[PDB]
């Protein structure tokens, strides 16, 4: 079965690929989050021999092992349950398939854009079989403030600090775009106590995980008090949210806006989706231009009713 909780302040990850700038970005994030320890335990890269890479954990200097063979990495780091896969599109399929032969790995982020749809269907098939959650392909990843950040998600520390992604709030979100993920970080931090978790499922035809996959997790996560979904014209994914609410599976306040209203099957339009979600009791704004307003409005109501109790701002470390 698939996990409800993908990441925590104790998550350890293996990074596949040679991505020192991204790894250092994650460590800077880890440090400002006041994690006890670095979130990246090791790297895997078959194109070179074992060795170590130099990184900084605060002002301290540390070494992260890089393994030629994935098995060595897994075995020496049994505590790792997340793999972030920066493989190029030519290597992404085999490396992801190989990763799922190791049951410690419960979550895989697949970064590469351009993986053939038929290969992604096979990744999905194996992942659903093994109970492994896939975020992506063709995604920057996602972020869980105070806990874990996938690769380049959330930009520079400048951005991490401005949108206060170094500590949790009460709002979870999902979208296809990481372009729009960062905007969601910004909108949510200016209008609420901040992001609790955000995921970008990526733009491919068959995402490894869907909107509904994550909305369910959020529904089953006590720390999450409200949910924001940025949907889009095309496909019927958002209707699964309607049904979830009508069936009573989904009870927390949900805000949703589907982009693509000006694109001029019928049920697949942003217009139709927006209207149907609204009738189902989803908080849907008149337009993107009012998305922040309605998020803020739903948030203030949850604060008034004691559902959200805004934590006190503590400044971040160095």
């Amino acid at each position: 079965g698939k996990s409800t909780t993908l990441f925590s302040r104790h998550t350890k990850a293996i990074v596949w690929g040679m991505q020192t700038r991204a790894v250092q970005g994650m460590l800077d994030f880890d440090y400002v989050c006041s994690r006890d320890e670095p979130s990246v335990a090791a790297m895997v890269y078959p194109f070179t021999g074992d060795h170590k890479q130099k990184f900084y954990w605060g002002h301290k200097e540390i070494l992260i092992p890089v393994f030629k063979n994935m098995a060595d990495a897994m075995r020496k780091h049994p505590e790792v349950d997340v793999l972030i896969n920066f493989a190029s599109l030519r290597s992404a399929y085999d490396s992801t398939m190989e990763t799922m032969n190791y049951a410690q790995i419960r979550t895989i982020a697949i970064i590469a854009e351009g993986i053939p749809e038929a290969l992604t269907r096979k990744l999905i098939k194996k992942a659903d079989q093994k109970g492994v959650t896939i975020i992506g392909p063709a995604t920057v990843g996602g972020i869980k403030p105070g806990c874990f950040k996938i690769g380049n998600t959330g930009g520079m520390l400048d951005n991490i600090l401005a949108s206060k992604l170094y500590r949790p709030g009460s709002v979870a979100y999902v979208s296809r775009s990481g372009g729009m993920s960062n905007e969601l970080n910004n909108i949510i931090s200016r209008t609420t106590d901040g992001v609790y978790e955000g995921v970008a499922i990526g733009g491919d035809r068959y995402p490894g995980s869907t909107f509904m996959d994550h909305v369910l997790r959020y529904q089953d996560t006590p720390g999450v008090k409200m949910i924001v979904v940025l949907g889009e014209i095309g496909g019927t994914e958002e209707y699964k949210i309607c049904r979830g609410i009508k069936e009573g599976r989904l009870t927390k306040p949900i805000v949703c806006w589907c982009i693509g209203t000006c694109a001029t099957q019928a049920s697949e339009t942003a217009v139709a989706k927006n209207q149907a979600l609204k009738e189902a009791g989803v908080f849907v704004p008149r337009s993107f231009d009012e998305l922040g307003e309605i998020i803020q409005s739903v948030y203030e109501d949850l604060v008034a009713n004691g559902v959200i109790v805004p934590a006190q701002e503590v400044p971040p470390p160095t």
């Binding site: 993986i115 053939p116 749809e117 905007e183 889009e232 337009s287």
Partner: protein, 424 residues
């Protein structure tokens, strides 16, 4: 993404690569005709054009050609030339689409009965590929999705020939089940081998003489190039039937092809007063939504984006195309340029904005003459430096340029630009 290919491309690949014991007739017997066709040369290259009567039809991703009377059937070569005179190079309308008929396919006519027409289709879904068969194909096939026998070939599964026989072909003539079964098996292996996501043959014709592929439509997964290039060759992905591309659209597409950055431009109304230049896929959709929501749909000049960390030179080249396009004619109310976007994760905002600045500087004179006002909202790496040089080039040139940061709601500038709200 999946992209359509021409009928001729699809047929060529099928004739080249399908492996079936069932005998496929008229392999490679097709000739392509355009307005630039040398007819004496074509005849010498396809002498078979004289050996029997012909069929001629446009090959430009138009559906229902037969029933809409766009197919010339059972004609001599002269009759084909005659049928072409009033059509080739002329405008035609199909549904809400209008364009020039400029690409035609000539094939041999195949005499056959309606009872010899069948329907086959294969298409991709998340759960696998569906294979469809119906025993009554053709222009008259009707609502085939409601009627056809259907079978899902699951992810990483095999199409079982017994299922084809015992389920797909239950309603087919008993003497044709064997040839049909072999063909479909072959068609499916081909579909999978060449990374198709859609493959329709309607009608598929079987006579005493064998199998004829009369009509074909198809899409392949274009991202599979690195796997299939050895079989695909220089495969071409045609645009939908409609207007021709503008030279500037072709230039941007060529820009796009030459890099991992995404660079897209489509002109809606080249005389519209509202131009956009947005960073981010989602963002560009949202800005267009916003413009239409506020009543600007008829003045919306273009849509597109520049994404995925383009360099300063690439952004310069993109921007100068836009600036040229928006300075062809004056508008009585002047014009608006929306330079917007969400907050980038890795695009270098300082690098890209330097490109746009250079472009603004080269076109400053006409931009003033055309009363262009520029609104800018952007975040990401080095964004502060980017906004600075952008405001700065406004002061230097005398072009009104209002710049905003992440404190401003992404779409707010649209309302400002259109005078629905004040500029702070």
């Amino acid at each position: 993404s999946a992209k359509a290919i021409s009928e001729q491309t699809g047929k060529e690949l099928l004739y080249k690569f399908i492996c079936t014991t069932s005998a496929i007739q008229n392999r490679f017997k097709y000739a392509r005709v355009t307005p630039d066709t040398d007819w004496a040369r074509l005849l010498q290259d396809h002498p078979w054009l004289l050996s029997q009567n012909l069929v001629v039809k446009p090959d430009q991703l138009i559906k229902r050609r037969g029933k809409l009377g766009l197919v010339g059937v059972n004609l001599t070569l002269d009759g084909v030339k005659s049928w072409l005179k009033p059509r080739l190079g002329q405008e035609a309308t199909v549904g809400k689409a209008t364009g020039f008929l400029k690409n035609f396919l000539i094939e041999p006519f195949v005499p056959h009965s309606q009872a010899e027409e069948f329907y086959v289709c294969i298409y991709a879904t998340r759960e696998g590929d569906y294979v469809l068969f119906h025993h009554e194909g053709g222009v008259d096939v009707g609502d085939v999705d409601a009627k056809a026998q259907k079978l899902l070939v699951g992810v990483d599964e095999k199409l079982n020939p017994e299922d084809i026989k015992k389920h797909l072909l239950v309603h087919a003539p008993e003497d044709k089940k064997e040839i049909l079964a072999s063909f479909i098996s072959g068609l499916f292996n081909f579909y999978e081998d060449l990374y198709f996501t859609y493959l329709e043959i309607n009608p598929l014709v079987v006579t005493k003489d064998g199998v004829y592929v009369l009509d074909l439509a198809a899409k392949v997964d274009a991202t599979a190039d690195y796997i299939c290039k050895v079989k695909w060759g220089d495969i071409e992905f045609p645009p939908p039937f409609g207007r021709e591309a503008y030279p500037e659209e072709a230039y941007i597409a060529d820009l796009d092809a030459k890099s991992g950055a995404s660079l897209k431009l489509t002109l809606l109304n080249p005389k519209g007063r509202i131009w956009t230049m947005v960073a981010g896929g989602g963002a560009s959709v949202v800005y267009s939504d916003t413009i239409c929501d506020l009543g600007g749909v008829n003045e919306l000049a273009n849509y597109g984006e520049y994404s995925g960390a383009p360099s300063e030179q690439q952004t310069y080249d993109y921007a100068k195309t836009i600036l040229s396009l928006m300075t062809r004619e004056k508008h009585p109310d002047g014009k608006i340029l929306i330079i917007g976007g969400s907050i980038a994760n890795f695009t270098n905002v300082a690098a890209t904005f330097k490109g746009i600045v250079r472009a603004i500087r080269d076109y400053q004179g006409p931009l003033k003459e055309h009363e262009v006002t520029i609104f800018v909202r952007r975040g990401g790496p080095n964004y502060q430096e980017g906004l600075r040089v952008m405001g700065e080039v406004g002061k230097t040139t005398g072009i009104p340029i209002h710049v905003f940061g992440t404190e401003t709601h992404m779409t707010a500038i649209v309302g400002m630009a259109l005078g629905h709200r004040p500029i702070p």
